[PDB]
Structure 1
Amino acid sequence: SQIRQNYSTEVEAAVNRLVNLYLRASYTYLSLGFYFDRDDVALEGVCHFFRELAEEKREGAERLLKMQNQRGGRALFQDLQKPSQDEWGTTLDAMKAAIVLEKSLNQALLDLHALGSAQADPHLCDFLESHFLDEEVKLIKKMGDHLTNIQRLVQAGLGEYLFERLTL
């Protein structure tokens, strides 16, 4: 590539893998959102919380793909595996699964950052720091806060309703 400079094949491949992970996360949140939209679940605030996160993760994937091209790397797409569950249980179960998912994404970001540092690729390192690392930390804090409030509240039915009405 005429523009490619200081951009290792290892980082290029890892960025494609991270795109897949972000799209998979978006898909998982799409599934979560529509599950809470079921008439036998019916927690609209929880549905909206996860649909927003689906959009965020898709946007993160697109930012990665834009960066791949800016550096002269080549986007390669793989199958997107379906989410791990078809039904997501309670808001508590769903929020635990979301924090698991975000921690996995954060770990992938940290692994890529370490790779970038080992490859002396400061543009990559700054990109991740600037657009992804703090967003993950803030989101995980928010989920942990939500989990604590959900747990405090669970008369589990009343608790789930109040959390959805008064927090989300």
Structure 2
Amino acid sequence: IFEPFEEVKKELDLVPTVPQASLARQKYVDESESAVNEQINVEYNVSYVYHAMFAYFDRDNVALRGLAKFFKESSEEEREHAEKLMEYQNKRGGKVKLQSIVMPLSDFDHADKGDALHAMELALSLEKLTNEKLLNLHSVATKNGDVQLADFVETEYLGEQVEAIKRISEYVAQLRRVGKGHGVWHFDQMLLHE
């Protein structure tokens, strides 16, 4: 027999009184809170790197407008991934802690591979690294028995990340097939209108 007011007597007492404490926080341990903050920083870093890549391909002497557009839009998307995690942190009553963002590379030319292929391979590696970080976040949730955090990560991030990795892998493959010069420019035109 479940008596709400009997079993809720204790709960009503646990309600925080000091203004700075979260009222919502429940079964959300410090390590989980910190793991979410770490992932916010990972997504924000990738956003920043993509913005650097946009800035490179937007150069008049590089003039790959499709790549510039793709990286510009990707940068915006990554910031949204970071923001979703910041909002999640607050839903669970953790405190968002934005960390420093390191200076990214500015130049993406590559003598052998060519700038386009080099940049897409870097992007692929960045998305694979992001996947590793997400799987680490998931591992922290699972270790700490945080069922809803693990579900949130699976549902909002993991499937999406698999799709992002396949998408970029396909770009790498196509850039390898078309080759430098005319081929790269044409692939770029495709991307511009994709």
Q: Runs (4+) of structure 1 moved beyond 2 Å? A: none
* Identical-pair percentage: 40
Encode CA deviations 1:92-124: one digit per residue, 9 max, x unaligned. Answer: 000011011111111000011111111111111
Instruction: State the structure with more CA Rg.
Output: 2
For residue 33 of structure 1, report the CA deviation from its aligned partner. 0.7
Return closer, same or farther for 1:53/1:167 CA change in 2, 3 Å cut-off.
closer
CA distance in 2: counterparts of 1:166 and 1:113, whole angstroms: 36
CA distance in 2: counterparts of 1:165 and 1:25, whole angstroms: 24
Aligned partner of 1:120 among 128, 138, 145: 145
Q: Are 2:43 and 1:22 equivalent residues in the alignment?
A: yes
CA distance in 2: counterparts of 1:122 and 1:50, whole angstroms: 34
Hey, what does 1:3 align to over in structure 2?
Answer: 24
Structure 1 stretches of 5 or more lacking a match? none
Equivalent residue letter for 2:177: R
Equivalent residue letter for 1:91: A
8 Å CA contact 2:67–2:191 kept in 1: the answer is no
CA distance in 2: counterparts of 1:166 and 1:2, whole angstroms: 51
For residue 167 of structure 1, report the CA deviation from its aligned partner. 4.1
Encode CA deviations 1:43-72: one digit per residue, 9 max, x unaligned. Answer: 111001111110111000000000001101
Aligned partner of 1:49 among 41, 65, 70: 70
Hey, what does 2:130 align to over in structure 1?
Answer: 105
Aligned partner of 1:157 among 174, 181, 190: 181
Aligned partner of 1:146 among 161, 171, 178: 171
Aligned positions, number = 166
CA distance in 2: counterparts of 1:16 and 1:166, whole angstroms: 37
CA distance in 2: counterparts of 1:57 and 1:160, whole angstroms: 25
Aligned partner of 2:60 among 11, 23, 39: 39
CA distance in 2: counterparts of 1:60 and 1:37, whole angstroms: 24
Return closer, same or farther for 1:163/1:113 CA change in 2, 3 Å cut-off.
same
CA distance in 2: counterparts of 1:52 and 1:135, whole angstroms: 16
Equivalent residue letter for 1:87: D
Q: Which has the higher helix share?
A: 1
TM-score by length of 2: 0.83
Structure 2 stretches of 5 or more lacking a match? 1-21, 110-114
Q: Are 2:87 and 1:62 equivalent residues in the alignment?
A: no
Hey, what does 2:10 align to over in structure 1?
Answer: none
